[model samples]
Target: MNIFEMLRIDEGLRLKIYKDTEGYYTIGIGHLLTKSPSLNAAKSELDKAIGRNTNGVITKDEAEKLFNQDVDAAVRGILRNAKLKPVYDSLDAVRRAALINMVFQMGETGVAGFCNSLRMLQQKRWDEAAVNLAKSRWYNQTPNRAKRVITTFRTGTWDAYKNL
Candidate 1:
């Protein structure tokens, strides 16, 4: 299958946020809402469908539609943001994927706010960018995920990413 199909399979479709297999509150496949906003946009759309009803649910197809829009926005944000686009274009697919994932996690404004990291990116200093990323509180909040992205920034290798 193609990339989208692969991601669809890998990510796995879930109808809505609910107790996880481990009895954790999670939504949209594996996203842990309290831990991160990975599926925040998708959840917002689901909220609209449910009209605030706590028990409201969505279909996998519905979730996919929202996910597509959310991912598209993330991609566009990476492409159009001043601090992201040029440097993004200069990177290989692995690093480009890193930027896209960063934009997805933090939003364009949030990622752009990483001034030191962006500067290093603009200057083509991959190692410094990785260092700058590690210096952020984002690292403390999500160490495992941060390590993956940071290594991707430092090494430009998809293999360094634990989850993408």
Candidate 2:
């Protein structure tokens, strides 16, 4: 599956404001309104997109729109990172989706903190990259999701998501 479909499964759809795993005010498919570059700007964009003041609620279609926007931003954020761009470019679609999924959940800055893992991924050391990722608190915070992502990295295929 593509990153969009993968993220749709992982993030799930939320039409109303709810706290995320880290307790941030979020909506749509893992869109962190509170963690946005500008909370007011984000709200305004949502309001505009939905053609009305959301009053903390949106439709499924609106959520899908927001999801697409967030996913695009995540992809752009990853490609814009000088250190990550080359690594991202070297991977096939499956592994690229895995990286995008990680960035979608943790943000580029958070993923960038995995210096050793990124290095291993860049060097094509799949097992080492997976091991390094497993060592993080991220792995513990979202064990199931982390396992899927790590397995994707380790295998460079969609095998991890087959059962899903």
Candidate 3:
């Protein structure tokens, strides 16, 4: 078999959407997916998947298609409208990825509410940004994740979440 096919096989195959060990929606050889934006979108998309009992069972291929589309829109929205665009563009890939991850998780508008943190980041005040981030209701909601992200904010390390 070709290399691409071999790699795909290694990742395994699922014909239907299923939750991963993390309870996250996943499908088709481990492609992680999200509903994002609207619960209506997922309900609407799930209604159209090709199979019986397909209420929420997106075909694996369909899962990947929808995920790619959603991801593209999220990235575009963040780049276009996030308040920290100047600093964001100046960040390295690791930090940029972390920023995007936050935007994706919180939704762009949610992240936009972090005015103080964004201001600190824009000023290159790493510790102040961490303080601002850590002080949020978002942080209180997810302390472990917030701690790791705060460290990344503080140190700009790609691996800040690694050892945690």
Winning candidate number (lDDT): 2
Residues 40-155, candidate 2, lDDT per residue (tens digit)?
66677567666898877898888888888888998999989987798899998889999999989998999989989988998999988888899989998999999999998999
In order of TM-score, best first, we have 2, 1, 3
Itemize residue pairs with steric clashes in candidate 1.
none
TM-score of each: 0.70, 0.89, 0.65
User: How much is 2 displaced in model 2, in angstroms?
Assistant: 1.1
Model 2 C-alpha RMSD vs. true structure (Å) is 2.8
Determine which window of 10 residues in candidate 1 has minimal summed lDDT: 1-10
Model 3 local distance difference test score: 0.62
Global fold similarity of model 2 (TM-score): 0.89
Compute the lDDT of residue 120 as modeled in candidate 2: 93
Q: Write the per-residue lDDT of candidate 3 for residues 1-164, one digit (tens) a residue.
A: 22122224333567565665445555555455554544445444455443334655556566556545545666788778847576578776556655765664567888888888888887878888888888888788767666766776678774544432
Q: Point out the worst 10-residue segment of candidate 3 by lDDT.
A: 1-10
Give RMSD to native, each candidate: 5.6, 2.8, 7.3
Compared with the true structure, the alpha-carbon lDDT of candidate 1 equals 0.65
